């Protein structure tokens with residue numbers, strides 16, 4: 001279904017059931033029916049009926065293998081997170097899907113307070129044994145905190161975070177990947193200067209690339225922070241080096257810009 005239509009099918013008991021799942025995600029991936037029922041203050045038979053219908057609408061996934069338990073689907077977690085944004089008065093209407101990939105779905109929306117914005121719903125974690133709701137939620141929260149810390153720099157203004165959703169400014173600009181520039185050396189230098197300012201604020205982007213820089217005749221913006229780290233966190237320096245190396249390499253291949261990677265890293269790091 002489309003997200004606005006899905007929202008309109010939800011009654012107050014539906015939201016209560018979703019609240020109950022959300023508040024127990026830290027303890028269980030599949031929240032047991034008994035806990036959903038007791039938290040929602042809804043009888044178990046009724047609770048089960050609501051969860052069946054929510055599964056039919058692709059909002060929850062129910063499993064029975066070891067016990068009767070439920071969790072959100074991506075659609076469901078996004079819907080619930082949207083509901084939190086609406087209830088907090090930060091969003092008035094969800095609008096059209098802007099784009100969706102393996103990592104997120106980004107929707108247009110309108111806010112009386114914030115104007116025409118975007119809400120980005122996080123699909124995946126961006127995190128130990130090296131071999132999903134709490135991880136998508138952690139991605140959203142980390143992105144929100146990074147954007148807060150960087151306010152006043154060339155990033156979107158950030159407005160709210162709930163669940164897997166981050167509400168922020170719509171940037172009218174396209175990915176660098178898609179835009180041929182005639183002053184590539186200047187554009188690269190502006191990106192590197194922004195990286196330096198992030199670092200001064202104690203933030204490393206962690207996925208700097210041609211897909212995460214937006215450009216217009218007006219300037220550049222940098223987006224996409226769920227994988228960001230604080231300076232001091234394990235591997236932060238190598239992660240920063242990678243950001244600098246990757247963006248320089250992009251410019252090297254695309255424009256044959258000559259920029260020394262080691263010097264660029266050292267300049268950033270010294271002050």
Ligand SMILES: Nc1ncnc2c1ncn2[C@@H]1O[C@H](COP(=O)(O)OP(=O)(O)OP(=O)(O)O)[C@@H](O)[C@H]1O
Nearest residue numbers: 101103104106118156168169170171211223224226
């Ligand atoms: N504030 C915004 N303004 C305009 N377009 C945006 C904005 N945020 C995201 N987009 C568009 O949506 C696309 C996907 O967003 P983004 O790169 O932030 O996340 P992602 O890589 O899909 O997922 P994740 O959050 O897990 O990294 C962007 O490449 C961009 O084109």
Ligand SMILES: [Mn+2]
Nearest residue numbers: 211212223224
């Ligand atoms: Mn991205």
Ligand SMILES: [Mn+2]
Nearest residue numbers: 103207224226
């Ligand atoms: Mn990403």
